[PDB]
Design a protein around this ligand. Structure first.
Ligand SMILES: COc1ccc(-c2ccc(S(=O)(=O)N[C@@H](C(C)C)P(=O)(O)O)cc2)cc1
Ligand SMILES: [Ca+2]
Ligand SMILES: [Ca+2]
Ligand SMILES: [Zn+2]
Ligand SMILES: [Zn+2]
Length: 163
């Protein structure tokens, strides 16, 4: 359940930056979803996420449409919701979300908190899990985001990489 080559961050205090926003949510809701998604991983690892408002962060978050400068283009409504890059410099660790989705912070498709939480797993070096109850399962499926907590399989995965 660990990315090929087992790449990971050489540091536990990582910065992130939301570059732009989606018309589907208020800017604050996006920040809330993002900050909460990072927290999911922080409570199960040594990772500490620090937000910056400008400049390059270790993990840049952005909403893009179709072709957006990195070859893994998005595909319009539905289908690919987002993607991220394994730990590394430059684009490594970055997380891109399809700007053509009906993003939400509720259970309706698609909850940004859950998708971001998922992608950050990749941003941290986690690969997919075959466990349907895992956040890193290959397919999205809303889960009660209320008292939602990182599934044990993902705890195992993140732990296996950073303790
Ligand atoms: C609450 O649990 C989950 C939440 C979101 C996903 C999820 C699954 C697939 C995608 S994807 O948009 O299909 N991207 C995949 C790929 C086509 C680029 P990948 O980034 O997961 O590899 C995004 C989020 C899975 C589980
Ligand atoms: Ca980066
Ligand atoms: Ca899409
Ligand atoms: Zn991209
Ligand atoms: Zn994934």
């Amino acid at each position: 359940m660990l990315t090929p080559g087992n790449p990971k961050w050489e540091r536990t205090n990582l910065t992130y930056r939301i570059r732009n926003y989606t018309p589907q949510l208020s800017e604050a809701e996006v920040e809330r979803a993002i900050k909460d998604a990072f927290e999911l991983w922080s409570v199960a690892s040594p990772l500490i996420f620090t937000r910056i408002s400008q400049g390059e962060a270790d993990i840049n978050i952005a909403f893009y449409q179709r072709d957006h400068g990195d070859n893994s283009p998005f595909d319009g409504p539905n289908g690919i919701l987002a993607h991220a890059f394994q730990p590394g410099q430059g684009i490594g660790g970055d997380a891109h979300f399809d700007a053509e989705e009906t993003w939400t912070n509720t259970s309706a498709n698609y909850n940004l908190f859950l998708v971001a939480a998922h992608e950050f797993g990749h941003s941290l070096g986690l690969a997919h899990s075959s466990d349907p109850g895992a956040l890193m399962y290959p397919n999205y499926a809303f889960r009660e985001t209320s008292n939602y907590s990182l599934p044990q399989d993902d705890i195992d995965g993140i732990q296996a990489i950073y303790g």
